[PDB]
Design an enzyme around this catalytic site. Structure first.
Site, PDB file in Angstrom:
ATOM      1  CB  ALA A 221     141.788  74.786  59.692  1.00  0.00           C
ATOM      2  CE1 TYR A 222     138.422  73.287  51.760  1.00  0.00           C
ATOM      3  CE2 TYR A 222     138.626  70.914  52.072  1.00  0.00           C
ATOM      4  CZ  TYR A 222     138.115  71.986  51.376  1.00  0.00           C
ATOM      5  OH  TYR A 222     137.296  71.749  50.295  1.00  0.00           O
ATOM      6  CG  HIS A 223     140.777  67.683  55.316  1.00  0.00           C
ATOM      7  ND1 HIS A 223     141.892  68.206  54.700  1.00  0.00           N
ATOM      8  CD2 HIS A 223     140.057  67.075  54.343  1.00  0.00           C
ATOM      9  CE1 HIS A 223     141.854  67.921  53.410  1.00  0.00           C
ATOM     10  NE2 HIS A 223     140.750  67.236  53.168  1.00  0.00           N
TER      11      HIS A 223
ATOM     12  CE  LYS B 292     134.679  70.609  55.319  1.00  0.00           C
ATOM     13  NZ  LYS B 292     135.671  69.678  55.930  1.00  0.00           N
TER      14      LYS B 292
ATOM     15  CD  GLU C  26     136.898  69.122  48.165  1.00  0.00           C
ATOM     16  OE1 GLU C  26     136.479  69.577  49.246  1.00  0.00           O
ATOM     17  OE2 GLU C  26     137.516  69.819  47.332  1.00  0.00           O
TER      18      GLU C  26
END
Lengths: 222, 222
Positions: B125-127, B158, B111
DNA sequence: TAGCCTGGTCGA
DNA sequence: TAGCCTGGTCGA
């Protein structure tokens, strides 16, 4: 100072050190921010002396190996750690009572798990479904924050604006931003404000202001 | 062991100790849970010896006062603390690569504030707004948890099911319940399971199982 | 200066 | 055994 008789033998409790220390305060500097820092300094000086009578003799005659050294090294370090934290709790408890703040719970149960250092105005009011939730207050106490501050978060699911009291000589601006976003508000003794970044200094509360806010907030409670 | 030349003088880094330690592993015990505990034990024994060559001489000739003792006492304690933590990070990083887990980010930004020890399968992949959020994984690493575990929470807003890897010789049942509710899942080396309460043992993951789950989960990623 | 805690003591 | 951290070292 001349200490109580059995202290040389049995290491006194936190309340006992302070109970003795009280008869040796400067007096008066009636500002709560001044009083804390002073009572801490007096308490610490007594602690240093008690500590010496238990270790200084062992300190001088050296250690045969690392495993010997580090056992007492950790023991002594961790004595200070445990006692420093309880000391600040106690000093604030005494100051609340002395300055008119009678409405607080020490060992208050919130959700059943984590218990905050201080809950306001009551453990009861916190579970009172018709007490205005925005009038609730909570005070976490940390002598130093560092990374450990995030452990204070969800101690009171019901309270989003939480107060953290600390003696740390400045919290980084980056670190302060994280605290704000997580709904944390610093209460810091007036004198220590100059160690905090200029941008942060503005949003910092003193002990005096904290007590004054809550005193007025709960003046209408028996 | 016979150490590298300049170690007596300059205290080596975490990667350097392990880089040297690698040429001294038992071999093979191809189980990842076995390998970690072994590589830790080998690394530690080397560390103990390097530490001795820097302190043992100072240890023996005693200390004149508490303030002298406690400065090195804290220094040495805190050397161990800083290095123990980085060691475990490194050992897991090496094990992931060696066992087929190539899909992980070390210094991944989530974040913008807190950065988790390990993020899976990618910082990208997280974003990635179209990567299935339930296939995301995060691994916090703590040699010991104690009170400090709560500092790992919102490192990945997330991801709600978060994994904590630890070497602690048993987490209390009361303490484990808090971890569950906060969405934390323990990964613990097979061997250490017997130290955890019987009720907890059931929900404990091994390193091997963790790697196997994630390997299959990301097998379809380049 | 953010994260570490190869962590024991104190007091519910 | 949950909470403390009268905290310095390491490596981004």
């Amino acid at each position: 100072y001349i200490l109580p008789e059995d202290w040389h033998l049995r290491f006194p409790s936190g309340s006992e050190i302070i109970q003795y220390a009280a008869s040796h305060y400067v007096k008066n500097s009636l500002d709560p921010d001044e009083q804390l820092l002073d009572r801490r300094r007096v308490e610490y000086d007594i602690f240093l002396l008690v500590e010496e009578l238990h270790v200084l003799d062992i300190i001088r005659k050296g250690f045969g190996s690392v495993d010997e050294f580090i056992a007492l090294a950790n023991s002594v370090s961790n004595r200070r750690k445990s006692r420093a934290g309880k000391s600040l709790e106690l000093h604030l408890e005494h100051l609340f009572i002395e300055h008119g703040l009678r409405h607080f719970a020490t060992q208050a149960i919130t959700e059943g798990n984590k218990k905050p250092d201080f809950l306001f105005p009551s453990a009861g009011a916190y579970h009172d479904t018709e007490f205005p939730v925005e009038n609730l207050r909570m005070l976490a106490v940390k002598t130093t924050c560092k990374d450990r501050w995030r452990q204070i978060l969800n101690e009171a699911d019901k309270i989003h604006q939480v107060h953290l009291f600390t003696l740390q000589e400045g919290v980084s601006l980056a670190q302060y931003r994280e605290m704000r976003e997580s709904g944390v508000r610093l209460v810091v003794p007036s004198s220590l404000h100059k160690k905090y970044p200029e941008a942060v200094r503005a949003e910092l509360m003193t002990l005096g202001a904290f007590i004054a806010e809550l005193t007025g907030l709960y003046a209408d409670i028996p």
